[PDB]
């Protein structure tokens, strides 16, 4: 019988690094067509192209019942008024749920159905978020320090980026008049 | 179609409490036939019947792709020389994996396959443990404060307590001459 070996790994809740994980870097230039203010995007890319977020992922083969986990370090920033966020995605197998545990910083999650019905959940250290089957999810950094969290997801969930890539979320998170606001996407 | 509502909840990393969750308590009286020293067990039940652990569970219906999560507060203690532990279980759907995130205290996990081969993984705050498909899993508190962790598991995993209830784990975790030891279970 083939059994896989249990393992433990240290996650630094201060940095989000998992040593030995598959590390992914997303710079702002990897995020064309994601932010409402297209000229601000282009300008911040030309002037800096900052890292928006980094992922440390521990992934299994795509098998039903098995589980992947990953930390994300989402860096502080705005493109125009719109706070830095993850690209966001549905799962390829839509009915797969997810669990997030917020570890550090201040942020939130934007979630939406295949119909564009939308929800915002605040996240501070210790907030666990239940992402139900069929909800697209995007995390947002609303602070001045990195927003770091752990996600645990079905190993066979997969990723569906395309739909969010072209249409976006139906709601957006901005800093307007010194205040964090979740408002309608004026482009959806 | 019908979509369940996303929610966040605060987990308290000092106490392991999740408000609104399904609370479960195990006292030593709930653990007959688990510990090597049955007379110690009997005396301690008759004297104090202490809490061994508390569970705070957020559970979905048993459906493929969906996820549950729960914290456990494993109290410090010994039955004779043997550190306080959880009952331990395989999943009813045997191939369902599990992810644990250690939050407070000091301990570890005993894992074993249906064959009976056992692994011990140390857990400190920040340790994430991957429990693979087919591994029974028990957590052990080897410290002097609650050992506190969050478990994320497939909603359809279920629990299979029976085999572990009857025969235990092939390894025990004991304190002997001021030293934590993982040794073969004499009753195996
Ligand atoms: O949803 C899970 C599983 O993949 C997360 O670990 C995100 O993948 C990560 O926060 C980066 O964001 P995306 O670019 O994947 O939206
Ligand atoms: O493995 C997961 C799934 O439920 C944990 O939440 C344990 O259920 C908990 O630590 C109590 O341990 P048991 O009494 O179920 O072995
Ligand atoms: Zn996901
Ligand atoms: Zn389990």
Curated annotation (Swiss-Prot), chains A, B:
Enzyme Commission (EC) number: 5.3.1.9
GO MF annotation, one: iron ion binding
Subcellular location per the Swiss-Prot or TrEMBL entry: Cytoplasm
Main location: cytoplasm
Annotated TM spans: none
Entry keyword annotation includes Mitochondrion: no
UniProt temperature dependence: Optimum temperature is 90-96 degrees Celsius. Highly thermostable.
Activity across pH: Optimum pH is 7.0.
Signal peptide positions on this chain: none
Matches recorded under CDD domains: cupin_PGI
GO biological-process terms attached to the record: gluconeogenesis; glycolytic process
Record flagged with keyword Cytoplasm: yes
Cofactor: binding comment: Binds 1 Fe cation per subunit.
Activity regulation remarks: Inhibited by mannose 6-phosphate, fructose 1-phosphate and fructose 1,6-bisphosphate.
Subunit structure: Homodimer.
Name of this chain's protein: Glucose-6-phosphate isomerase
Gene source species: Pyrococcus furiosus (strain ATCC 43587 / DSM 3638 / JCM 8422 / Vc1)
């Amino acid at each position: 019988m083939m059994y896989k070996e249990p393992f433990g790994v240290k996650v630094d809740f201060e940095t989000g690094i998992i040593e030995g994980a598959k590390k992914s870097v997303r710079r702002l230039s990897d995020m064309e067509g994601y932010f409402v203010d297209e000229r601000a995007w282009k300008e911040l890319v030309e002037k800096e192209d900052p890292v928006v977020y980094e992922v440390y992922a521990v992934e299994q083969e795509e098998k039903e019942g098995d589980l992947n986990f990953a930390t994300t370090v989402l860096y502080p920033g705005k493109v125009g008024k719109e706070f830095f966020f993850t690209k966001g995605h549905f799962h390829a197998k839509l009915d797969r749920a997810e669990v997030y545990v917020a570890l550090k910083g201040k942020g939130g999650m934007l979630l939406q159905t295949p119909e564009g019905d939308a929800k915002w959940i605040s996240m501070e250290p210790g907030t666990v978020v239940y992402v139900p089957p069929y909800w697209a999810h995007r995390t947002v950094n609303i602070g001045d320090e990195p927003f770091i969290f752990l996600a645990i997801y079905p190993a066979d969930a997969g990723h569906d980026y395309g739909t969010i890539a072209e249409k976006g979320f139906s709601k957006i998170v901005i800093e307007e008049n010194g205040e964090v606001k979740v408002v309608d996407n004026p482009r959806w």
